[PDB]
Amino acid sequence: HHHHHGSSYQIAVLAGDGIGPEVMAEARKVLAAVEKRFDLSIEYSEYDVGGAAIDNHGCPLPEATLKGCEAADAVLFGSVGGPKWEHLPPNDQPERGALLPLRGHFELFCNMRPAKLHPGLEHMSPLRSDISEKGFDILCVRELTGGIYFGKPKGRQGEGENEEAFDTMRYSRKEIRRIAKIAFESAQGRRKKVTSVDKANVLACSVLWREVVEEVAKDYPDVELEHIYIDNATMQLLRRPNEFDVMLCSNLFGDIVSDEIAMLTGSMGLLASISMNSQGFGMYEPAGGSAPDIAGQGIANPVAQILSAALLLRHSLKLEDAALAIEAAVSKALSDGYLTCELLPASERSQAKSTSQMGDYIAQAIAEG
Amino acid sequence: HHHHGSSYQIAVLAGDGIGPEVMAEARKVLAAVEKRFDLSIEYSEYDVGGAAIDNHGCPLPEATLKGCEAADAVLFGSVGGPKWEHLPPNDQPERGALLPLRGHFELFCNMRPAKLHPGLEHMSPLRSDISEKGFDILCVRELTGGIYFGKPKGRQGEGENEEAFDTMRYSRKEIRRIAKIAFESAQGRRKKVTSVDKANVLACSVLWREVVEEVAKDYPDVELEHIYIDNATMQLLRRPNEFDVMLCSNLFGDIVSDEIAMLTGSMGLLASISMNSQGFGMYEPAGGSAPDIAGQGIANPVAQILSAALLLRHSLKLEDAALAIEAAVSKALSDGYLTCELLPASERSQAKSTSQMGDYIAQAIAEG
Ligand SMILES: CC(C)[C@H](C(=O)O)[C@@H](O)C(=O)O
Numbered sequence: 001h002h003h004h005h006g007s008s009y010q011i012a013v014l015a016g017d018g019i020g021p022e023v024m025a026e027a028r029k030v031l032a033a034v035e036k037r038f039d040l041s042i043e044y045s046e047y048d049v050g051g052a053a054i055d056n057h058g059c060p061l062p063e064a065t066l067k068g069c070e071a072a073d074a075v076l077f078g079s080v081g082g083p084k085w086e087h088l089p090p091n092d093q094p095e096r097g098a099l100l101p102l103r104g105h106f107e108l109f110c111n112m113r114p115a116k117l118h119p120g121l122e123h124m125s126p127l128r129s130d131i132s133e134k135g136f137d138i139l140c141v142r143e144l145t146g147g148i149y150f151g152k153p154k155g156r157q158g159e160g161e162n163e164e165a166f167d168t169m170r171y172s173r174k175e176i177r178r179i180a181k182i183a184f185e186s187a188q189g190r191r192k193k194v195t196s197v198d199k200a201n202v203l204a205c206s207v208l209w210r211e212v213v214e215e216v217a218k219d220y221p222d223v224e225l226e227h228i229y230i231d232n233a234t235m236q237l238l239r240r241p242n243e244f245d246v247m248l249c250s251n252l253f254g255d256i257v258s259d260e261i262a263m264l265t266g267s268m269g270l271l272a273s274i275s276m277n278s279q280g281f282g283m284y285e286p287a288g289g290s291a292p293d294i295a296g297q298g299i300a301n302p303v304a305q306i307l308s309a310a311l312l313l314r315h316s317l318k319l320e321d322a323a324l325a326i327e328a329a330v331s332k333a334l335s336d337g338y339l340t341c342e343l344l345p346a347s348e349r350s351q352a353k354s355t356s357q358m359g360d361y362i363a364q365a366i367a368e369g
Numbered sequence: 370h371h372h373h374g375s376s377y378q379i380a381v382l383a384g385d386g387i388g389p390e391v392m393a394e395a396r397k398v399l400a401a402v403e404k405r406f407d408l409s410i411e412y413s414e415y416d417v418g419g420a421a422i423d424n425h426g427c428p429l430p431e432a433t434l435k436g437c438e439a440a441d442a443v444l445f446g447s448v449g450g451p452k453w454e455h456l457p458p459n460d461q462p463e464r465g466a467l468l469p470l471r472g473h474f475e476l477f478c479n480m481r482p483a484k485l486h487p488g489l490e491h492m493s494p495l496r497s498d499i500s501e502k503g504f505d506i507l508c509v510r511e512l513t514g515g516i517y518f519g520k521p522k523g524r525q526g527e528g529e530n531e532e533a534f535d536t537m538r539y540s541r542k543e544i545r546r547i548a549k550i551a552f553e554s555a556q557g558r559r560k561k562v563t564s565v566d567k568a569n570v571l572a573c574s575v576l577w578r579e580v581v582e583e584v585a586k587d588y589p590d591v592e593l594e595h596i597y598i599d600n601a602t603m604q605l606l607r608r609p610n611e612f613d614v615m616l617c618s619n620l621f622g623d624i625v626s627d628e629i630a631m632l633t634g635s636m637g638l639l640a641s642i643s644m645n646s647q648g649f650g651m652y653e654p655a656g657g658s659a660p661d662i663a664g665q666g667i668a669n670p671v672a673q674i675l676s677a678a679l680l681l682r683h684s685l686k687l688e689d690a691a692l693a694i695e696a697a698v699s700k701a702l703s704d705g706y707l708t709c710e711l712l713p714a715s716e717r718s719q720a721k722s723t724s725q726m727g728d729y730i731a732q733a734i735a736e737g
Pocket residue numbers: 095096099255569570599
């Protein structure tokens with residue numbers, strides 16, 4: 001879809017399952033405030049995805065939803081999955097079923113998961129206090145359309161005790177180069193360090209990864225490159241998270257490293273995910289899941305979904321001041337002690353703010369300019 | 370080679386860096402144990418790793434491979450160092466010794482026991498309210514299948530379409546043999562197995578989870594749960610006391626064991642068992658060759674010493690001898706015999722040397 005100057009921007013809204021819809025409502029409330037403020041013309045089109053789409057259409061990614069994403073500038077996505085549908089066959093489940101085909105179809109090779117310890121919440125981290133007091137801010141860049149996720153041969157053959165399954169990890173120089181360039185450009189604008197995570201002592205793919213990373217590293221002389229094996233990286237993120245800036249990982253290794261870093265913040269309800277292609281189209285979603293055990297109770301933390309909209313404004317729509325406004329309003333809520341239940345002790349449950357109290361505060365803070 | 374009623378044969382492969390100095394403490398402890406229990410053991414020493422490169426021109430000399438073939442078990446140190454890290458990859462110590470050993474000897478079973486020792490919970494990089502509760506997690510890693518040894522591997526093409534590939538493969542036989550060991554291990558511990566996979570993405574993990582469900586029916590007293598690798602990395606942070614045995618494929622077990630080792634904050638205490646179906650195995654510290662402290666007499670020998678205890682239990686079936694070493698090491702750690710790295714720098718004068726630790730532990734076994 002190409003945007004024309006003065007036309008409305010088009011956002012496909014795919015709220016999904018569980019807490020998706022209730023936090024999406026708060027992202028739409030904060031977006032309405034931003035639209036009025038910075039003067040925007042945005043149109044929204046809602047589509048089912050995930051378990052909601054299994055329930056309404058019989059599959060997790062209906063053709064009408066694919067077509068609706070194709071017509072938009074950007075997708076604001078909630079979360080999918082839940083026990084209702086985990087009995088289902090594999091290709092048929094909400095997450096495998098919606099997320100892998102979305103990524104493949106739109107060539108969303110670039111995943112970026114920003115995580116940091118926010119001022120005054122260092123204590124909720126599961127790290128020892130002398131480590132969490134040091135802070136960290138780590139951007140994970142993960143290659144999303146290659147490696148072992150999409151490689152073939154992939155399947156199962158044979159019989160008796162010798163029946164075997166197989167998966168193939170594959171990477172080309174073109175695929176490694178595009179993802180490495182995003183990690184180095186990111187690092188150039190942050191603290192100028194890329195840690196590339198591989199298993200180059202075992203995997204041919206990682207020997208090639210490390211070679212092509214070294215090639216691209218030549219074009220970014222201001223940025224320090226280091227390499228680390230995936231097993232050692234899980235250890236070093238525990239011991240010295242303040243020493244990393246941008247992580248650059250393959251598809252499986254980035255799946256792992258981004259989750260470990262997310263849990264090290266102790267505040268996953270704050271975390272957002274960007275999945276983009278080379279034309280600037282992307283989907284923007286909370287890193288955490290559909291949390292079906294609390295769906296509908298108004299207790300979910302909507303900051304991850306709100307931040308997802310800020311990153312959509314910045315990355316796809318290039319509406320930079322609109323994005324920073326959201327981010328400032330979120331930070332003002334968190335420092336003015338507007339916290340949801342999972343960011344307070346169990347004894348302070350009655351000071352917790354609801355999903356809608358949080359969105360109200362953040363939307364009001366946007367209007368205050 | 371099998372054991373007949375005669376002397377046991379151990380092959381000693383000390384390797385590089387701190388390998389020799391902590392092997393010396395392990396040999397001291399073994400001498401005490403052979404005296405107290407009247408054991409009959411013969412030892413043979415072989416170069417491996419960079420020592421082997423420097424002396425023989427390759428990291429796993431044919432003499433070293435044969436010396437292991439002739440033994441009931443191997444006591445292994447560590448290999449690697451910056452002197453050798455510039456060489457072509459197959460010529461380097463680790464890749465060139467460990468992967469050929471594992472493949473040659475069919476060491477499909479890797480076991481890495483990890484726990485917070487009493488009084489050292491504060492070493493963990495976890496928040497105190499988590500670490501103070503303790504944990505003890507045994508990682509069972511499948512060691513000779515999956516993407517480590519799968520074929521094909523290599524490259525195709527040229528320029529932008531130069532591409533590389535690796536293949537993860539697993540048969541039912543390979544999943545069932547390593548699942549059994551996790552279930553037997555759990556039955557002797559806290560009766561829970563957590564199988565770590567990525568069954569929403571990998572065909573090998575769909576077959577892993579099916580074969581693990583089959584094997585679990587034979588151990589109805591053990592709780593089975595499945596967890597995806599990315600989530601397992603987060604749940605081991607928040608609730609490590611809730612896990613007993615982890616059951617993992619080769620790459621997933623390489624990653625999960627390393628995260629758990631760092632959750633202890635005391636990697637100098639940790640040992641690794643690599644065994645085959647015949648009970649032959651190689652027993653070694655989980656930690657590396659630490660060349661920047663080699664020869665200083667600062668290295669912690671507990672992981673090497675505990676490697677010799679596990680060799681006695683798993684390969685030699687000498688349970689009382691194994692338990693003796695474990696009791697002596699626990700005595701040392703609770704009686705203020707701790708090395709450099711287990712104490713604040715401010716308390717360095719209270720730290721024990723490599724040989725002071727061996728002496729004390731050997732002295733303690735010499736006391737019934
Ligand atoms: C649901 C699953 C296929 C997915 C992945 O592995 O990428 C998820 O873990 C994620 O990280 O977004």
